[PDB]
Design a binder for this molecule. Structure first.
Ligand SMILES: O=C(O)CCC(=O)C(=O)O
Ligand SMILES: [Fe+3]
Length: 257
């Protein structure tokens, strides 16, 4: 339905995020969920901690070690939506598997407000977008996300969420999601997430898509600049991000009238 897709894109452009229900069917959800659980339990994950406590555990670059996650990262429907929303051809940058849950003596805490762009070591960071796919039901209390609509159109912080003049006065929209729903959000959209205050883990994936012309651009933060699976040598500033490691979401056409 091209009309509903136009409306959806227009919402994305105006707000800086959009909710898309039922992007995965029930079987797909049950497949990706199992693989998410398997990876978290049997492979390496990374703790995102703060003084406040545990923000989350995640499997980094999950697509590199798991085909099943790569299929999700390049899912045809998700990819097609992303490209339509972005308005250009895209490449995959990374997929992560995200877990928020309460453990013994380790309570889940919120994800503090931020925007994603400044942590992206590539040239088109400012127009990147993220697909966050719910693999279980994520009501408010299980730590769904909140977005500040229009915040992607604000100028740069002079550093920085909620630092620009008037920004604190801007309304915020909390978006609970059913299993198999996703959101897309722009790299400049301010977003946060609640603590998981339930007994059921919050499980999802988050995939970052970038302009197909993206080039390497170090942030100067070692941890963000070091891209696994890109060869022995560090990457040079300006180096294009291409190939299997940063795949095009849509096969480029050889066939033309
Ligand atoms: O899942 C969360 O708690 C935060 C996710 C996030 O910041 C992102 O997907 O860019
Ligand atoms: Fe984020």
């Amino acid at each position: 339905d091209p009309a509903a897709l136009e409306r959806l894109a227009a919402r994305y452009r105006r707000d800086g995020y959009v909710h898309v229900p039922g992007v995965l069917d029930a079987g797909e959800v049950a497949e990706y969920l199992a693989e998410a659980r398997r990876l978290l339990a049997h492979e390496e994950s990374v703790r995102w901690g703060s003084g406040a406590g545990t923000v989350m555990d995640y499997v980094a670059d999950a697509q590199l070690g798991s085909d099943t996650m790569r299929r999700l990262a390049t899912h045809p429907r998700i990819a097609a939506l992303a490209e339509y929303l972005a308005g250009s051809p895209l490449r995959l940058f990374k997929l992560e598997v995200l877990l928020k849950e309460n453990k013994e003596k380790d309570a889940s805490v919120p994800t503090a407000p931020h925007h994603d762009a400044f942590a992206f070591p590539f040239s088109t960071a400012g127009t990147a977008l993220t697909a966050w796919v719910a693999l279980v039901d994520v009501p408010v209390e299980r730590g769904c996300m909140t977005f500040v609509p229009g915040s992607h159109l604000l100028p740069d912080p002079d550093t920085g969420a909620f630092t620009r003049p008037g920004e604190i006065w801007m309304p915020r929209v909390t978006v609970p999601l059913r299993a198999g729903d996703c959101t897309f959000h722009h790299a400049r959209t301010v977003h946060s997430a609640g603590a998981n205050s339930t007994d059921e883990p919050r499980l999802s994936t988050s995939a970052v898509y970038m302009d197909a012309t993206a080039a390497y651009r170090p942030t100067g933060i070692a941890f963000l600049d070091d891209l696994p699976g890109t060869g022995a040598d560090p990457l040079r500033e300006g180096a294009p991000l291409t190939g299997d490691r940063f795949p095009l979401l849509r096969r480029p056409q050889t066939r033309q009238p």
